[PDB]
Structures are given as structure tokens and as C-alpha cells.
Amino acid sequence: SIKSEFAEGAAVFVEGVAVFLTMMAAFQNGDKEAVAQYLARGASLYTRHEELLNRLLQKLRREGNKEAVTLMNEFTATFQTGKSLANALIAAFKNGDDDSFESYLQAIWKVIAKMATILDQIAKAI
Known part of the structure; x- marks a missing residue:
């Protein structure tokens, strides 16, 4: 349903925003190994979100x-x-x-x- 797809897409957005905020903090703190891991995670979150946006x-x-x-x-x-x-x-x-x-x-x-x-x-x- 519209509502199901919207809520699932919203939760992926929440995850992505949280990862992005954590990545900004890691960058400021000089933890580039963590930044690398968050950039990799953002990539799979992009794909996950794009699918849900299409479906919605x-x-x-x-x-x-x-x-x-x-x-x-x-x-x-x-x-x-x-x-x-x-x-x-x-x-x-x-x-x-x-x-x-x-x-x-x-x-x-x-x-x-x-x-x-x-x-x-x-x-x-x-």
C-alpha cells in the first residue's frame, strides 16, 4: 500500500540521516576508518531507498x-x-x-x- 511503502521509505531515510550525522562526527573527530565504513553503508542505503521511492x-x-x-x-x-x-x-x-x-x-x-x-x-x- 501507499502507507506501507511510505513508512518503510521514511525509516530508511531516518537510518540514512543517522548514518550521515555519525559520519560527520567521525570526520570531525579524525576517525577516517569509521568514515570509510559509513560511506560504504550509505551506498547500500541509497539502493534500498531508491527501490522504495520507485515503489511508492x-x-x-x-x-x-x-x-x-x-x-x-x-x-x-x-x-x-x-x-x-x-x-x-x-x-x-x-x-x-x-x-x-x-x-x-x-x-x-x-x-x-x-x-x-x-x-x-x-x-x-x-
């Missing part, structure tokens, strides 16, 4: 909920376009470029915050 969008389009569809479109467009920032973050990790890594963490967080606002609006429109 299919169900929303079939039921014809216009407000929820347009919000979900913005969430998914941001999720997909934001992959470019994630790839740059990974590149900075591989290059040992901590200044760039820091910059992308802070820019990504701004996007995550926007996505969390959209997600709350989706919950109120389903």
Missing part, C-alpha cells in the same frame, strides 16, 4: 493523488540529482581532500534538510 511513486500515480505525486516528484528529483554531490564527496574521500570532503558534507546536509521537509509534507498529503 508507482502506487501514488495509480491512485491519482495530485498533491502527493508532485511532492514525491520533488523528493525523488532531489534524491536523484543529489547523487552528484554524493559522488563528489566520495571523490574527496579517495583523494584525501578533507577540505572538499567537509564542504560537501555541509552542502549535502542542506539538501537532506530540504528532503526532510518534503517528506513531512508527503506524509500530510497521503
Whole structure:
């Protein structure tokens, strides 16, 4: 159902946000081995989330909920376009470029915050 897919996607979002916050703290504390593990985990969370977003969008389009569809479109467009920032973050990790890594963490967080606002609006429109 729409509600089942939404709740499962929300829980993956919560996991990803938590991992991201933990990764920012590890980076600040100079624990790069932990940062590497969190970056690897974020990758599988991306795949898990993308599947749930697809499933939810299919169900929303079939039921014809216009407000929820347009919000979900913005969430998914941001999720997909934001992959470019994630790839740059990974590149900075591989290059040992901590200044760039820091910059992308802070820019990504701004996007995550926007996505969390959209997600709350989706919950109120389903």
C-alpha cells in the first residue's frame, strides 16, 4: 500500500540521516576508518531507498493523488540529482581532500534538510 511503502521509505531515510550525522562526527573527530565504513553503508542505503521511492511513486500515480505525486516528484528529483554531490564527496574521500570532503558534507546536509521537509509534507498529503 501507499502507507506501507511510505513508512518503510521514511525509516530508511531516518537510518540514512543517522548514518550521515555519525559520519560527520567521525570526520570531525579524525576517525577516517569509521568514515570509510559509513560511506560504504550509505551506498547500500541509497539502493534500498531508491527501490522504495520507485515503489511508492508507482502506487501514488495509480491512485491519482495530485498533491502527493508532485511532492514525491520533488523528493525523488532531489534524491536523484543529489547523487552528484554524493559522488563528489566520495571523490574527496579517495583523494584525501578533507577540505572538499567537509564542504560537501555541509552542502549535502542542506539538501537532506530540504528532503526532510518534503517528506513531512508527503506524509500530510497521503
